[PDB]
Amino acid sequence: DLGKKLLEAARAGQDDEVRILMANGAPFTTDWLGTSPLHLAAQYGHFSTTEVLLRAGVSRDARTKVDRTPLHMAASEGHANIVEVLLKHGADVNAKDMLKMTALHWATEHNHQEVVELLIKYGADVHTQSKFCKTAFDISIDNGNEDLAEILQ
Amino acid sequence: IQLWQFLLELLTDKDARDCISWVGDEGEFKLNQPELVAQKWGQRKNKPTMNYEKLSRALRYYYDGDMICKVQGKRFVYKFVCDLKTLIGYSAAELNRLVIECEQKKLARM
DNA sequence: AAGACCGGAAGTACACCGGA
DNA sequence: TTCCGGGACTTCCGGTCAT
């Protein structure tokens, strides 16, 4: 269907088809786990597609069934380019998922220093505690990454 | 809120370890205290008479899916057959390590 | 002979939808 | 577009197995 074609197109990073489906009237849907086209575009690193979705009016802070937002995915995957546009369109830098973790937590867990710096610039709260009482700093320490630990203390 | 989300919540709550906890690093978990977990579930769904009987039935409906399944032979043990690392960002193994680390910090403090 | 798990049948509540 | 009827458990239960 149209909604699915949109989900599939975003995942595929087919921005023109995305424009196409949204024109026809494709319903902004999500899969069995609450994954939306924006989560998919940001997760897979589809810049033009993400941008097209944003300029289409899709929910910036859409939540999956584990409470992840597209920013969470983007940060987790290290797509600074995607993280930047999402923030530039009003994405909450401090959104927390099911484990009470922020994009900062994930970009740190996955050692994405540039995304960590970018997040820190967009006012991200550096000292939020996860469901495990961990701030991003703790994650960097647990990961033995002293370079990140220094910017996160 | 779906049963799987609630169980995953409990499984990541260091304070719940006594009623439900992971058993291994492959996704299997056990309802160490099935009736308590059921009571807790009922409180989330606002079902005053929820119990393990009814909760297990709801768990069985998951048998057709790609989320949870039973662990044959092990009393009160089930398994998250979905890929947790892609779902929440941590595997069952990673989650179990983290929840145990948290419980230790708690015991050390108290 | 007398608990843990299974899975069908029926009910409910709430999300989503294609239409008037 | 507003309005509105029409696709995840909860509860109850009969039955298998193995102790």
C-alpha Rg value of chain A to the nearest Å: 16
Q: How many domains does chain A have?
A: 1
What range does the domain containing B2 cover?
Answer: 1-110
- Find out whether A61 and A95 touch, Cβ atoms under 8 Å: yes
What's the sign of the alpha-carbon dihedral A41, A42, A44, A49? positive
Listed residue (B100, B6, B16) closest to A66, CA to CA:
B6
Spatial separation of the C-alpha atoms in residues B94 and A138, rounded to whole Å: 15
Which of A66, A109, A141 to mutate against chain B (most B CBs within 10 Å)?
A66
Spatial separation of the C-alpha atoms in residues A37 and A19, rounded to whole Å: 12
Size of the A and B interface in Cβ pairs below 8 Å: 34
Residue B21 backbone dihedrals phi, psi, to 5 degrees: -155, 155
DSSP string, A26-88: ------TT---HHHHHHHHT-HHHHHHHHTTT--TT---TT---HHHHHHHHT-HHHHHHHHT
**For chain A, what is the total number of helices (H) and then of strands (E)?**
10, 0
Strand C neighbours (CB under 7 Å) are A 1, 3, 27, 29; B 34, 56-57, 59-60, 63, 70, 72, 74-77
Please judge whether B87 and A33 are an interchain contact, meaning their C-beta atoms are less than 8 angstroms apart. yes
Please judge whether B2 and A65 are an interchain contact, meaning their C-beta atoms are less than 8 angstroms apart. yes
> Residue A92 corresponds to which tokens in the numbers above?
């909450």
- Find out whether B77 and B27 touch, Cβ atoms under 8 Å: no
DSSP string, B44-97: HHT-TT--HHHHHHHHHGGGGSSSEEE-TTSTTEEEE-S-HHHHTSS-HHHHHH
Spatial separation of the C-alpha atoms in residues B88 and B92, rounded to whole Å: 10
- CATH number for position A121: 1.25.40.20
What range does the domain containing A28 cover?
Answer: 1-153
Structure solved using which method? X-ray
- CATH number for position B39: 1.10.10.10
Phi/psi region, residue B28 (left: phi>0; alpha: psi -120 to 50; beta: rest), is: beta
Q: How many domains does chain B have?
A: 1
Q: What is the distance, to the nearest Å, from the Cα of residue B28 to the centroid of all Cα atoms in its chain?
A: 9
Task: Count the residues in chain B.
Answer: 110
